From Swiss-Prot:
All copies of domain Ig-like C2-type, residue ranges: 2-80, 81-183
Primary site of residence: membrane
Keyword DNA repair: no
Gene: LILRB2
Domain notes: Contains 3 copies of a cytoplasmic motif that is referred to as the immunoreceptor tyrosine-based inhibitor motif (ITIM). This motif is involved in modulation of cellular responses. The phosphorylated ITIM motif can bind the SH2 domain of several SH2-containing phosphatases.
Full-protein interval shown: 26 to 219 of 597
Name assigned to this protein: Leukocyte immunoglobulin-like receptor subfamily B member 2
Length: 184
């Protein structure tokens, strides 16, 4: 009856040609699990062991939006909330900078800019929680993101990525980390 939960361990953002487990968690009385991917495709039965889909080496093809259901008490459950599985590392890293400065006054805001030598369809900023930038169908070499208000009691560590609009779950190698200083 109750919709299952679908999660990824370590995370749902995975560095490339690497591995991760997708876990569909339903009733203890589940008789069968089915896992689907939209880029629906069905993840082969032999791959899903008790609702667990452990992955060997990720790829353009494994990235995308997953949902799972299980059967119990003569019903298929509803589909789980979608789990978005992203692979990183497919393109050269962009550069991440703070405009005007990564030193930010407590309660203030800053703009972080992601810039690339090769044009990308869009950019992603993640706090180490990711945000994408406006799409450009012809592509752009930079995106900007507003961050804050920043507090002195939290860490503000970000990386950015580029991606192609036709494969949005496949991202560049991450930019170098950028951390903000809130002076105290």
């Amino acid at each position: 009856i109750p919709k299952p939960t679908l999660w990824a361990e370590p995370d749902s953002v995975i560095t490339q040609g690497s591995p991760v487990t997708l876990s569909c968690q339903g009733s203890l009385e589940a008789q069968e699990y089915r896992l689907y991917r939209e880029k629906i495709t069905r993840i082969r039965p032999e791959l899903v062991k008790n609702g667990q889909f452990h992955i060997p080496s990720i790829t353009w093809e494994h990235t995308g939006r997953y949902g799972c259901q299980y059967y119990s008490r003569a019903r298929w459950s509803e589909l789980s909330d979608p789990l978005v599985l992203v692979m990183t590392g497919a393109y050269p890293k962009p550069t991440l900078s703070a405009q005007p400065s990564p030193v930010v006054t407590s309660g203030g805001r800053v703009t972080l800019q992601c810039e690339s030598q090769v044009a990308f369809g869009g950019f992603i900023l993640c706090k180490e929680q990711c945000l994408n930038s406006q799409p450009h169908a012809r592509g752009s070499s930079r995106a900007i993101f507003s961050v804050g208000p920043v507090s002195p009691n939290r860490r503000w560590s970000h990386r950015c990525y580029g991606y192609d609009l036709n494969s949005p779950y496949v991202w560049s190698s991450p930019s170098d980390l950028l951390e903000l200083l809130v002076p105290g």
